């Protein structure tokens, strides 16, 4: 039902080939867009039917540079305009010339903030037919409309049913309804011309009845079907006894609705908001995560791109590589651009070296995205991030991608520790030497139904197979991050530790081991190797069949400790008579 939007504006897609798939994965089946709705650079005959479910956009709606004749957003009721496209525009239709003929925004009755920008769309018929004044909410708005009528198109008059000649298209279903300019009294929204047709003040797009439960959409906030000004506090205050109290009916605020708990990758708070950020003077604490207040001076926080002093920084360079030293968790994104590995004659900044990237060796978690569009030719993989376990994707590239690999010479990913992509899409393309893409259990990394891998122009599977390039034979299900036994996701035999093996050295060998959860762990040094039998049952000196030297009950010992003890005829340590 709920998904996030994108952040491309009029920028070209990295992969025109997968651009349509991207939009589908992001928006298909969504009713609410927690972000901007951007439909740009579309081909003709595009399968846009997946957009039919959208009812609300939290941000702006941008449709640009599309050759499509129609965009199926008939169910769209509100463009809230939290963010606006350019000069305060909530809706922008640009350069759609192929090209749009109808708006078909039948359900669109409200814009809360911003104006409407429709320009250079030389097919569009009804951009100047819609009574935008009615659509704009009662509240003071710029409500600037820029309507380009240079359509160069012979358009049909609105259906006879469209009293007032207001329509979104040539059909009767395209007739525009009016919710404000037809109201009795001072009502912001109505079903009709009578006082009895007035909608509840908390209603936005209109209503089916007078109650706040009858709203088509909520103006301020949706609480489980009821439009209300606020989400019920988690903790309330007794003004008569001066005491705070827990509220059984309290809920968390997520976007514009109540939840019983914050959605995955979102932090809960004591004010009751779901956030992607932990406010200053607080800490992120696991249980499921929440943001807790610092009672004592806050711990060191490592930051990535997009955060703090790195907010305006495009990429990691030799100028800031050192800032990741000693970090396990980076609050922000990472990006490696051509400018990161090349030099900059302007700022006189040195290129990153292979040995400098090692600063990320200790990195386990990225809260943002990982964008790599450049990489040293001396590094056949991304193993410098081999210890990377989680990419949260709280910050997404272009508002969509949490993991992107473009134009790299890497043969395999090698990200063997990577077990979770909390959010966002993955894009791997134009990596003509990269084989181990389809060998990765991506379905095991994704958490949200809206996540998927997009890829193209990577090394052909046929070529990988032809050369015998594949996962290790001991690698379970053939799922691996690379060709080595150390890069496998799971082992069909023993894990050992970081290498698939046939067996542990239990019965044979000097450096004897024991089996523990399919791992191969060493026997205690004081343990005697058993030829043809089990050397030990564990790593402790009291878990061996026999001592390498002699006993110090219950443990094996090399030499007695100094209660000074000595090796007696028993073959064991005993308290000495000499003191």
């Amino acid at each position, epitope marked *: 039902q709920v998904c996030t939007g994108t952040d491309m504006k009029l920028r070209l897609p990295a992969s025109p080939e997968t651009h349509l798939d991207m939009l589908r994965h992001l928006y298909q089946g969504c009713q609410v867009v927690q972000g901007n709705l951007e439909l740009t650079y579309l081909p003709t005959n595009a399968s846009l039917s997946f957009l039919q479910d959208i009812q609300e956009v939290q941000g702006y709606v941008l449709i640009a540079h599309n050759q499509v004749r129609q965009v199926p957003l008939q169910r769209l009721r509100i463009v809230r305009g939290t963010q606006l496209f350019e000069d305060n525009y909530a809706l922008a239709v640009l350069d759609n010339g192929g090209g749009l003929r109808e708006l078909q925004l039948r359900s669109l009755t409200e814009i809360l903030k911003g104006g409407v920008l429709i320009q250079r769309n030389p097919q569009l018929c009804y951009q100047d037919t819609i009574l935008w004044k009615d659509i704009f909410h009662k509240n003071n708005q710029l409500a600037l409309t820029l309507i380009d009528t240079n359509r160069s198109r012979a358009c049909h008059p609105c259906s006879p049913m469209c009293k007032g000649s207001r329509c979104w298209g040539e059909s009767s279903e395209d007739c525009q309804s009016l919710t404000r300019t037809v109201c009795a009294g001072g009502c912001a929204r109505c079903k009709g011309p009578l006082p009895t047709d007035c909608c509840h003040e908390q209603c936005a797009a209109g209503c089916t009845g007078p109650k706040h439960s009858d709203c088509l959409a909520c103006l301020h906030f949706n609480h489980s079907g009821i439009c209300e000004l606020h989400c019920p506090a988690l903790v309330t205050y007794n003004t008569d006894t001066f005491e705070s109290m827990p509220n059984p009916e309290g809920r968390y605020t997520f976007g514009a609705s109540c939840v019983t708990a914050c959605p995955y990758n979102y932090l809960s708070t004591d004010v009751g908001f779901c956030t992607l950020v932990c406010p200053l003077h607080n800490q992120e604490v696991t249980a499921t995560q929440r943001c807790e207040k610092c009672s004592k001076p806050c711990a060191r926080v490592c930051y990535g791109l997009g955060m703090e002093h790195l907010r305006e920084v495009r990429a990691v360079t030799s100028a800031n590589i050192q800032e990741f030293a000693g970090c396990k968790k980076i609050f922000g994104s990472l990006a490696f651009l051509p400018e990161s590995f090349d030099g900059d004659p302007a700022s006189n900044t040195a290129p990153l070296q292979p040995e400098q990237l090692q600063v990320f060796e200790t990195l386990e978690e990225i809260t943002g995205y990982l964008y790599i569009s450049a990489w040293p030719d001396s590094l056949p993989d991304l193993s410098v991030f081999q210890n990377l376990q989680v990419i949260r994707g709280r910050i997404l590239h272009n508002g969509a991608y949490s993991l992107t690999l473009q134009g790299l010479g890497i043969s395999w990913l090698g990200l063997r520790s990577l077990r979770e992509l909390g959010s966002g899409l993955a894009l791997i393309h134009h990596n003509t030497h990269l084989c181990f893409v389809h060998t990765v259990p991506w379905d095991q990394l994704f958490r949200n139904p809206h996540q998927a891998l997009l890829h193209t122009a990577n090394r052909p599977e046929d070529e990988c197979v032809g050369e015998g390039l594949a996962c290790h034979q001991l690698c379970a299900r053939g799922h691996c991050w690379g060709p080595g036994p150390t890069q496998c996701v799971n082992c069909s035999q023993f894990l050992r530790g970081q290498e698939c093996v046939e067996e542990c050295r239990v019965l044979q060998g000097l450096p004897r081991e024991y089996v523990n959860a399919r791992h191969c762990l060493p026997c205690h040094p004081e343990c005697q190797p058993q030829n043809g039998s089990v050397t030990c049952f564990g790593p402790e000196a009291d878990q061996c069949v026999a001592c390498a030297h002699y006993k110090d009950p219950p443990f094996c010992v090399a030499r007695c*400790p100094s209660i000074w003890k000595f090796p007696d005829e028993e073959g*064991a340590c*005993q308290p000495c008579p000499i003191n």
Partner: antibody
Amino acid sequence: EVQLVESGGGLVQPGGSLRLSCAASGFNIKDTYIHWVRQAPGKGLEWVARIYPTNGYTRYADSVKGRFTISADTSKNTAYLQMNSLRAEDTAVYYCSRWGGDGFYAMDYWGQGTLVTVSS
Amino acid sequence: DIQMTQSPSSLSASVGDRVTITCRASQDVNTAVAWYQQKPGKAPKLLIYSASFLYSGVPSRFSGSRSGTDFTLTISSLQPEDFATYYCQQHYTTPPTFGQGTKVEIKR
């Protein structure tokens, strides 16, 4: 001598859990073997589990394997025993003890014990 | 799993009398046996370690010995204060194991 103080006892229902602790003073528990022993009413002593924080290895009695987890916090110098899936037969006084010294492996250090009652 | 059989489970002797408590290991455990004493309302305390050796802080009234798998705890002069349950425990294997336990009554 040393001071050993058990806590965490009280009443828990069957199928629930109870977390025992034992604070130490006079020595660093890190370097010794930490044991828990339990005594059911009318019964003798039953060895339960040990932790050896120096290397973090644990051992359990067959009677508690799969249910009890033993650990210690060397910064708090306090031993802990997490007992899950408790049943009525687990009613006992639980004692903490340590094997003080290097080559000395007998329970010279003892606390007082705390009663754990498991009942609906 | 080394078993320890302790006996007698009940002894009775007058004050000042000599009392011996024994236990038999199912295995030869050398001297890896300790004797513990639990007073009413108290945790078990250590008396004898390494079969025969007296632990510092323990009354000189106690001493032990070993013969094969048979261990003995001996008190040369039984006191009223020695009314407690005694345990024979092996510390040779893991787990450590206890015998049934022995009680000694003061004869009167």
